[PDB]
């Protein structure tokens, strides 16, 4: 804090929630004017939930001297230059770091004064999470099996938008659609995807080299729990391989 009577913004998010680096963009609103320039840097070098975070030389937002309210919004990734209008523009045709992609949104904060310059942010994940578990049968086939078996995810919409200062929801820009592979690390898959309002016609692909690259394939829309892609969620499944097929356990959760 200044010691010339400035009062800057006091940032936080409230173990291994953030990494040292992390960047978010803020924006200190005067109702939808952006007050001085917009997108503000800001990183975090704290891990923690409740990690502080530190505006980039140049970048430090200050509280109006005259004591009025001003409200606060965020988004991370953090990008230097937005497309026109503060737009974040969301591409996940390229999986890995998954980070990269994971477009959050803070709730906005509404009346803040440099009498009480602290914001806690709370991010929400815009888009949705695939988190992939595979076993064998333990009968026809067995874990050492499926070694190196890929997952690919089919007719995903790869494009979309997202207002950083509006907040919402983000919105999918239709183009063709792409078959994405998922991130694979033994025999855990994940991926991040573009909400869909249904998950029909979409299907895993599970290419086994041990059945000679054997491919099992599996209608996502058929699991309980998966019949849209709700943003901000993260589908778990589990995945049951047999050489007379693949069987799959799902469940819906908050993502955090
Ligand atoms: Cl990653």
């Known amino acids: 804090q200044p010691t010339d009577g400035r009062v800057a913004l006091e940032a936080t998010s409230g173990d291994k929630t953030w990494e040292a680096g992390d960047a978010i963009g803020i924006y200190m609103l005067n109702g939808d004017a952006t007050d001085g320039n917009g997108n503000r840097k800001y990183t975090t070098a704290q891990t923690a939930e409740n990690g502080s975070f530190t505006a980039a030389e140049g970048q430090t937002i200050y509280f109006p001297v005259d004591?009025?309210?001003?409200?606060?919004?965020?988004?991370?990734?953090?990008?230097?230059?937005?497309?026109?209008?503060?737009?974040?523009?969301?591409?996940?045709?390229?999986?890995?770091?998954?980070?990269?992609?994971?477009?959050?949104?803070?709730?906005?904060?509404?009346?803040?004064?440099?009498?009480?310059?602290?914001?806690?942010?709370?991010?929400?994940?815009?888009?949705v999470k695939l988190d992939i578990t595979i076993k064998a049968d333990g009968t026809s086939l067995t874990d050492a099996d499926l070694a190196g078996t890929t997952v690919s995810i089919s007719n995903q919409q790869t494009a979309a938008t997202y207002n950083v200062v509006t907040g919402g929801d983000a919105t999918v820009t239709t183009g063709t659609t792409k078959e994405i592979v998922l991130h694979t690390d033994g025999l855990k898959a994940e991926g991040i995807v573009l909400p869909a309002a249904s998950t029909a016609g979409m299907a895993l692909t599970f290419t086994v080299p041990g059945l000679e690259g054997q491919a099992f394939h599996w209608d996502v829309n058929s699991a309980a729990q998966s019949k849209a892609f709700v943003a901000g969620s993260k589908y778990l499944y589990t995945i049951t391989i047999s050489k007379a097929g693949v069987e799959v356990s799902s469940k819906v959760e908050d993502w955090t």
């Open 67 to 127: 004591a009025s309210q001003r409200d606060f919004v965020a988004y991370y990734p953090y990008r230097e230059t937005l497309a026109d209008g503060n737009v974040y523009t969301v591409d996940v045709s390229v999986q890995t770091p998954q980070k990269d992609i994971d477009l959050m949104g803070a709730a906005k904060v509404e009346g803040k004064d440099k009498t009480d310059p602290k914001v806690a942010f709370v991010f929400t994940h815009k888009l």
